[PDB]
Write a protein that holds these residues in place. Structure first.
Motif, short mmCIF file in Angstrom:
data_model
loop_
_atom_site.label_atom_id
_atom_site.label_comp_id
_atom_site.label_asym_id
_atom_site.label_seq_id
_atom_site.Cartn_x
_atom_site.Cartn_y
_atom_site.Cartn_z
N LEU A 142 0.82 -1.20 0.00
CA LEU A 142 0.00 0.00 0.00
C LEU A 142 0.86 1.26 0.00
N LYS A 171 1.38 -2.65 8.71
CA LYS A 171 2.64 -1.94 8.62
C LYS A 171 3.76 -2.78 9.23
N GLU A 183 -7.49 -1.55 10.53
CA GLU A 183 -8.56 -1.85 9.59
C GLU A 183 -8.23 -1.27 8.22
N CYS A 213 -9.03 0.61 4.71
CA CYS A 213 -9.94 1.63 4.17
C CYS A 213 -9.92 1.63 2.65
N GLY A 233 -8.71 3.98 0.82
CA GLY A 233 -7.43 4.53 0.41
C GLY A 233 -7.27 5.95 0.91
N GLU A 283 -5.85 10.78 -3.33
CA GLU A 283 -5.92 10.09 -4.61
C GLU A 283 -7.35 9.98 -5.14
N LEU A 340 -7.69 9.47 5.56
CA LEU A 340 -8.15 8.29 4.84
C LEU A 340 -9.66 8.32 4.60
C1 LIG Z 1 -6.71 0.31 0.01
O1 LIG Z 1 -5.96 1.53 0.18
C2 LIG Z 1 -5.42 1.82 1.42
C3 LIG Z 1 -6.07 1.52 2.62
C4 LIG Z 1 -5.52 1.82 3.93
N1 LIG Z 1 -6.22 1.50 5.11
C5 LIG Z 1 -5.65 1.81 6.28
N2 LIG Z 1 -4.41 2.42 6.46
C6 LIG Z 1 -3.70 2.75 5.35
N3 LIG Z 1 -2.44 3.38 5.55
C7 LIG Z 1 -1.66 3.48 6.78
C8 LIG Z 1 -1.06 4.69 7.19
C9 LIG Z 1 -0.31 4.78 8.36
C10 LIG Z 1 -0.10 3.69 9.21
F1 LIG Z 1 0.60 3.82 10.28
C11 LIG Z 1 -0.69 2.48 8.82
CL1 LIG Z 1 -0.46 1.08 9.84
C12 LIG Z 1 -1.43 2.39 7.64
C13 LIG Z 1 -4.25 2.45 4.00
C14 LIG Z 1 -3.60 2.75 2.74
C15 LIG Z 1 -4.11 2.47 1.47
O2 LIG Z 1 -3.37 2.81 0.33
C16 LIG Z 1 -2.70 4.10 0.25
C17 LIG Z 1 -1.90 4.31 -1.06
C18 LIG Z 1 -2.82 4.07 -2.28
N4 LIG Z 1 -2.05 3.22 -3.23
C19 LIG Z 1 -1.27 4.13 -4.11
C20 LIG Z 1 -0.52 3.23 -5.09
O3 LIG Z 1 -1.41 2.44 -5.85
C21 LIG Z 1 -2.33 1.71 -5.05
C22 LIG Z 1 -3.07 2.66 -4.13
#
Ligand SMILES: COc1cc2ncnc(Nc3ccc(F)c(Cl)c3)c2cc1OCCCN1CCOCC1
Lengths: 312, 122
Positions: free
Chosen positions: A23, A46, A101, A103, A105, A109, A157
Motif C-alpha cells: 500500500l 505496517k 482496519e 480503508c 485509500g 488520490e 483516509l
Molecule cells: C486500500 O488503500 C489503502 C487503505 C488503507 N487502510 C488503512 N491504512 C492505510 N495506511 C496506513 C497509514 C499509516 C499507518 F501507520 C498504517 Cl499502519 C497504515 C491504507 C492505505 C491504502 O493505500 C494508500 C496508497 C494508495 N495506493 C497508491 C498506489 O497504488 C495503489 C493505491
C-alpha cells in the motif's frame, strides 16, 4: 526483502493473514494489505524493520496511542501488534507489526480522480473538515492530551463507510514545551531539531520555527495544521507551499480575493492561522462553528461523502 | 482496466431461487480474491460473500450462511452466486467486486459495474 513479504502468511492471534499487496513504501516500514484466510476480512499491515531503538521505542508508543483512540468513527481502528527479534527475522533486523482496519485509500488520490467533475462543493469540504476536526477533538480529550503534530491531507483516509479517518501516529506525542528566558540557546536548538523531524516542512508552525518568542509548543500545533488543510481543500493549494520560514513566522499568506464559492470558511481560516498559538481557536471552538455552518446549509456533516465513495 | 459484468437477476417471490453470474476482464482473475456485494435501498452497500483464488476458502455473511453458495471458474473468468430461500432483505442491486471487506461487512472495492437487480416480493 520488504518486497518479498508479499504472498506470505503472518500469524497474529487467532488470525492467519495473507499478504496481498503493497500500500505504501517507507524508508523504515512498508504498509501492506493483509487478508484473513478464515474470515475473508481485510486489514492494513505496517511492517517496521530496524535495529535503531529510537524508532523501535517510537512505534511502541504509536501503538499505545491507537489503542486509546480506539472506538472513534473518525480514527482508524487498531487490531493487533507483535514484536519480532533480530534473530527470528530474515532481514537480520528487529521486526514490528502494526495491524489496523483497511480503508478505501488516501483522500488525496480520490480527489484528483474527481477533479474532472469540477470544483468541490462547499458542503463536501465541510463534511471532510468537520470529520477531521472531530477526530482531533477526540485526541485532545484524552488524558493526557494527545498531539498529532503531523496533520496533513496525506494522513487523511477515506473509510469504506465513506467517512474520514486519521491514520498515522508516528509523530504523535503528549509532551508539551514551555520555553521561557531560563532556557539556554542550545536547549532551544536541541528541542527544535527533535520536533522538526516529526513535522512536514510546509506544515511547520511558527512556535517551532522561532523559539525565542516564548511560544508554548502544545496542542495548538494541530490547530495551525487544520487551518492549512481547510485552505488546501478550498483553494486546492497550500498557504505556505514554498515553506519559507519568514512567511510562516510572520504569518504571511494570501486568500484569493475573488473567491465566491468558499467564502463562509474565510473566518475560520484566519482564526486558525494565528501566529501566536495562544490566540488560535481551541478545537471545541472550531467544531462548534462548523456545526452552525452545517445547520445553516441543511447538511449533516457526519453523513458519508457518497460522491467520493462511488469514485473508482 | 478492471471490467465486470453481472447478470441473472430478476423478480422472484420469497422462498424462490436465483443464480447470478459475472464475467471479468482486465486483470488476472486466477490470482485474486473475488466477492459478491449488494446495494440495499435505505441501507447502502454491504458485503455478501467472497471466495479465495483457488476456491480453497469461501466466506459468507451471517444472514446468508447455508442459504447462498459462491463459486468461481478461473478457466472462463466467471463468478457464480447461487441464491435460495430468498427473503425480503435479499432485495437489492447485486455487484461483483475484487478483494474482501472490513469492519461490519463493508466492501473494500466499490462497484464500477452496472450490477444485476434482485427483487423479492409477492
Ligand atoms: C486500500 O488503500 C489503502 C487503505 C488503507 N487502510 C488503512 N491504512 C492505510 N495506511 C496506513 C497509514 C499509516 C499507518 F501507520 C498504517 Cl499502519 C497504515 C491504507 C492505505 C491504502 O493505500 C494508500 C496508497 C494508495 N495506493 C497508491 C498506489 O497504488 C495503489 C493505491
Amino acid at each position: 526483502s520488504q518486497s518479498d513479504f508479499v504472498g506470505q502468511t503472518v500469524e497474529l492471534g487467532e488470525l492467519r493473514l495473507r499478504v496481498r499487496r503493497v500500500l505504501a513504501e517507507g524508508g523504515f516500514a512498508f504498509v501492506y494489505e493483509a487478508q484473513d484466510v478464515g474470515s475473508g476480512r481485510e486489514y492494513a499491515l505496517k511492517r517496521l524493520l530496524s535495529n535503531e531503538e529510537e524508532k523501535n521505542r517510537a512505534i511502541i508508543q504509536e501503538v499505545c496511542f491507537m489503542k486509546k483512540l480506539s472506538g472513534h468513527p473518525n480514527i482508524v481502528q487498531f487490531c493487533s501488534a507483535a514484536s519480532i527479534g533480530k534473530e527470528e527475522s530474515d532481514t537480520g533486523q528487529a521486526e514490528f507489526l502494526l495491524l489496523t482496519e483497511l480503508c478505501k485509500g488516501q483522500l488525496v488520490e480520490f480527489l484528483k480522480k474527481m477533479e474532472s467533475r469540477g470544483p468541490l462543493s462547499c458542503d463536501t469540504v465541510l463534511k471532510i473538515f468537520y470529520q477531521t476536526c472531530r477526530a482531533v477533538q477526540h485526541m485532545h480529550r484524552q488524558k493526557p492530551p494527545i498531539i498529532h503534530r503531523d496533520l496533513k491531507v496525506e494522513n487523511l483516509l477515506l473509510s469504506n463507510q465513506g467517512t474520514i479517518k486519521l491514520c498515522d501516529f508516528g509523530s504523535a506525542t503528549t509532551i508539551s514545551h514551555y520555553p521561557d528566558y531560563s532556557w539556554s540557546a542550545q536547549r532551544r536548538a536541541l528541542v527544535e531539531e527533535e520536533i522538526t523531524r516529526n513535522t512536514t516542512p510546509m506544515y511547520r508552525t511558527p512556535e517551532i520555527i522561532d523559539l525565542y518568542s516564548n511560544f508554548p509548543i502544545g496542542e495548538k500545533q494541530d490547530i495551525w495544521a487544520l487551518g492549512c488543510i481547510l485552505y488546501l481543500l478550498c483553494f486546492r493549494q497550500h498557504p505556505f507551499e514554498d515553506g519559507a520560514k519568514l512567511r510562516i513566522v510572520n504569518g504571511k499568506y494570501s486568500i484569493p480575493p475573488h473567491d465566491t464559492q468558499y467564502t463562509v470558511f474565510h473566518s475560520l481560516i484566519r482564526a486558525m492561522l494565528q501566529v501566536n498559538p495562544e490566540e488560535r481557536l481551541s478545537i471545541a471552538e472550531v467544531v462548534h462553528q462548523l456545526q452552525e455552518i452545517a445547520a445553516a446549509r441543511n447538511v449533516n456533516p457526519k453523513s458519508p461523502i457518497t460522491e467520493l465513495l462511488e469514485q473508482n | 482496466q478492471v471490467q465486470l459484468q453481472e447478470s441473472g437477476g430478476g423478480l422472484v417471490q420469497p422462498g424462490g431461487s436465483l443464480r447470478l453470474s459475472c464475467s471479468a476482464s482486465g486483470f488476472k482473475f486466477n490470482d485474486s480474491y473475488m466477492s459478491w456485494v449488494r446495494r440495499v435501498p435505505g441501507k447502502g452497500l454491504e458485503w455478501v460473500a467472497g471466495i479465495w483464488e483457488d476456491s480453497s476458502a469461501a466466506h459468507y455473511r451471517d444472514s446468508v450462511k447455508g442459504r447462498f453458495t459462491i463459486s468461481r471458474d478461473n478457466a472462463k473468468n466467471m463468478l457464480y452466486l447461487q441464491m435460495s430461500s430468498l427473503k425480503s432483505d435479499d432485495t437489492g442491486l447485486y455487484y461483483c467486486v475484487r478483494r474482501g471487506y472490513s469492519g461490519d461487512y463493508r466492501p473494500i472495492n466499490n462497484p464500477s459495474s452496472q450490477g444485476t437487480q434482485v427483487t423479492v416480493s409477492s
